[PDB]
UniProtKB/TrEMBL annotation, chain A:
<dbReference type="GO" id="GO:0046872">
    <property type="term" value="F:metal ion binding"/>
</dbReference>
<dbReference type="Pfam" id="PF01255">
    <property type="entry name" value="Prenyltransf"/>
</dbReference>
<dbReference type="InterPro" id="IPR001441">
    <property type="entry name" value="UPP_synth-like"/>
</dbReference>
<keyword id="KW-0479">Metal-binding</keyword>
<protein>
    <submittedName>
        <fullName>Undecaprenyl diphosphate synthase</fullName>
    </submittedName>
</protein>
<keyword id="KW-0808">Transferase</keyword>
<dbReference type="GO" id="GO:0045547">
    <property type="term" value="F:ditrans,polycis-polyprenyl diphosphate synthase [(2E,6E)-farnesyl diphosphate specific] activity"/>
</dbReference>
<dbReference type="GO" id="GO:0016094">
    <property type="term" value="P:polyprenol biosynthetic process"/>
</dbReference>
<comment type="similarity">
    <text>Belongs to the UPP synthase family. Z-FPP synthase subfamily.</text>
</comment>
<dbReference type="InterPro" id="IPR036424">
    <property type="entry name" value="UPP_synth-like_sf"/>
</dbReference>
<feature type="binding site">
    <location>
        <position position="10"/>
    </location>
    <ligand>
        <name>Mg(2+)</name>
    </ligand>
</feature>
Length: 210, 217
């Protein structure tokens, strides 16, 4: 019985500036924090925890920024894959092959029997998502149906809750296509500063909406 | 350096309960307020003011509620259409045809030369929007491109700022397909209670934001 949570990670540069550390050290703190957050989501009974790893636009950042970010997220999967089910999706042709190869190996290696899923979406972009779906079915079905669209969207189910820390109130290409009834929560706390209590009051806010 | 603005109207039932008036009277206040808001948006230099009139789900309400809402929205256009450019889009097959006929007549009567556009989107729903675009081009083009998608999306351009009063922090069926970096502003104030000052403070918030578009400056 699915209940899901999606996190839009944010704040790594401001956190590096705040702490007087490198962007690499800030992304290392992000790796730690995302492992924590994954554990929190699991304890709270969410069936899938979605993490919006990257947009298409993110891959126009520098090669060093792309490498730093992708290694930090992948490291989350390296640490967690043995104890959960891992999956990923998105505009895979814009992800550098090194990360796709490692993430595919980790997905194949993950605990498929787990009742908890960590799911990465990479290269998020509604335009690219729709274009890929069209090109897949173009001329091959009489009409596109809601069922087929849902079966081919990057996020394979509706999102219950979406959280974006870091003070930006925007989706930044990370909006989940098939979630018309998702509740959103934004907070100024930088991701790397989020505590379990911050997460819990975020969930109080999200769950109490009448 | 041109900008556009989108409003997600909300709160008519709660406002009728708050004021102790009929739903019809609440939608009449909404009509008045949306005329105000359109004027405010024009004064602030926005090139287009988009209003998310309805979702597909809205049309599963009773026929009386649908008629009340659609008449209240159309009345905005009846009052202002002569001095601006009016246009509309969306999942038009779920809109009762009466309103489509009237809105088309109002569009023809509007000032297409105006430097300000009021644009209604009706029957918003990303699933229906995508399904409509697919079914339109299914088997008739070699591949879908970003240009064709952009040229066929309900909202004909990326949205800069969107405002949702009414206290719900969610997009419902109203997220604009081709606006990956739209800035969003939520406030608890009901639409029918929004003042010019509320709008201005929203604009201070929205205009002060550092827009990065996924890049590192």
């Amino acid at each position: 019985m699915m209940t899901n949570l999606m996190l839009l990670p944010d704040g790594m540069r401001r956190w590096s500036q705040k702490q007087g550390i490198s962007l690499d050290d800030s992304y290392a703190a992000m790796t730690d924090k995302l492992v924590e957050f994954t554990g929190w989501a699991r304890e709270e009974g969410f069936t899938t925890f979605y993490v919006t790893v990257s947009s298409v636009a993110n891959y126009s950042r520098s090669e060093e920024q792309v490498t730093t970010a992708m290694n930090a997220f992948t490291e989350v999967v390296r640490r967690c894959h043995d104890t959960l089910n891992f999956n990923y999706s998105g505009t895979l042709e814009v992800v550098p092959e090194r990360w796709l190869t490692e993430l595919e190996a980790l997905r194949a290696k993950s605990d498929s029997q787990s009742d908890f899923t960590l799911h990465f979406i990479m290269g998020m972009s509604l335009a690219h998502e729709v274009i890929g779906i069209f090109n897949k079915f173009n001329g091959k079905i009489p009409a596109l149906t809601e069922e087929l669209l849902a079966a081919n969207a990057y996020v394979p189910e509706p999102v219950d809750f979406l959280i974006r820390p870091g003070g930006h109130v925007r989706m930044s290409s990370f909006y989940p296509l098939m979630s018309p009834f998702a509740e959103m929560y934004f907070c100024p706390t930088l991701l790397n500063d989020m505590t379990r209590a911050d997460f819990d009051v975020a969930l109080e806010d999200l769950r109490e909406r009448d």
